[model samples]
Target: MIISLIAALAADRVILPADLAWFKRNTLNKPVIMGRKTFESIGRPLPGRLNIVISSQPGTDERVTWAASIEEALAFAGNAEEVMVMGGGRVYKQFLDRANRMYLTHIDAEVGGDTHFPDYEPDEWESVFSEFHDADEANSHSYCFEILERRGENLYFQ
Candidate 1:
């Protein structure tokens, strides 16, 4: 199974409007896994998808499954084609090496924040698809929606 690591980042590492919209498009009907902070940011379970939160103290939210680690989360994901990792840095780092594909929305503007996606080895991935958009009424900032896949894996990059 492949793990699709999804994230949006400003020049300063924050997520913006355009990114969130694309996130919805791709992750709408999948079993999505995320860190505690990302889950709390939404404050509720995402509809039409199995929401799995990685938190040691996940509390009593029966609406979601609690996973203490990435291994457990992957186990929870079972035999799915691809598991979505939507996160707050920590979870992304944990899945970095294992991610087969990435759905990234790169924003040109700088929106500073404490959260950021982990640094990736650019040579390890090659963009398989790309769509660019300028700042407009719908998108607050100019960005590119790119789908990148791991290299040397004989995967979707072809």
Candidate 2:
């Protein structure tokens, strides 16, 4: 399976709507992994996809899978070849190295937050494509949607 980390963060790494919608549009009909707190933040299952929530500890169904760890939740991604990991800091940290690609939107504001994405390690990644959006009535922040792949690694078949 190929892994794609999907996230949109402000200057301070806070998640926002356009970013969240971007996450939704990409992962629909596919499995999206998330941490338990991230799942609860939305307070429900993500419609049209498999929502696997990883609890903090290890354990035991539809509602469970108890204290499920990241790896367990990881292996449960949907049949699609590409999987989306919708993270909340720690979860993103866990998948950083394993991911083949990351669809991250860099927002144009310095909103503060306690968590952040791992440092920008440009040496290890290559920007594949970038799409910039202008700020408008519908979007709260102007952003550049960037897709990066592991540097020098070729897994080309999308």
Candidate 3:
């Protein structure tokens, strides 16, 4: 199975429009694993997909399929070829090591934000694809969409 991590980070940490578009285009009909904070941040479950919100709490609204842990959510998304990890900081920090691919949108400007993306050393990943867009571009933000893959050593190293 392929696990993908998706996030948007402005210089100041706010998620940008390009990130939302990426989610809309890639995550449709797939299962998404997010934290309770992320679910609450979005305000509601999205349509046409199974949303598994991980929380320490036992129950959630009917609109969301709740998982007490990441393992449970992964099992629920087992049949899916791809599992997308959406975020609210805590969730990303918890799952980054397990992710195989990362879809990121880096906005050119910063805005004040309380939340932030997890910090990792750049050497750990390789940029496989990237596209830059100017602020005036149609339907695009002054940002770059980047696709990254984790670097792994031989099995002997593990």
**Pairwise lDDT winner, candidates 1 and 2:** 1
Which prediction has more favorable TM-score, 1 or 3?
A: 1
Show model 2 residue runs off by greater than 4 Å. Answer: 12-17, 57-67, 153-158
- Over 1-158, each residue of candidate 2 has an lDDT whose tens digit, in order, gives 87889887788667546777877788898878888777768787788887777886422336533326666766676356888888889888988888888998999998775788877577888898899988888787789889998877666897
Q: Between 2 and 3, whose TM-score is larger?
A: 3
Q: Rate the local accuracy (lDDT) of all candidates.
A: 0.87, 0.78, 0.83
Error of 2 at 100 (Å): 1.3
- Name the candidate that leads on lDDT: 1
Q: State the lDDT of candidate 3 residue by residue for 1-158, as single tens digits.
A: 88888888888556545557777887889998898878888887888888998988745498888888889999989789899999868888889889888888888775786778887667988999998887764544588888898888657743
Off by over 4 Å in 3: 12-16, 137-141, 155-158
lDDT of 3 at 114: 75
The candidate scoring highest on TM-score is 1
Going through the candidates in the order shown, the clash numbers are 0, 2, 0
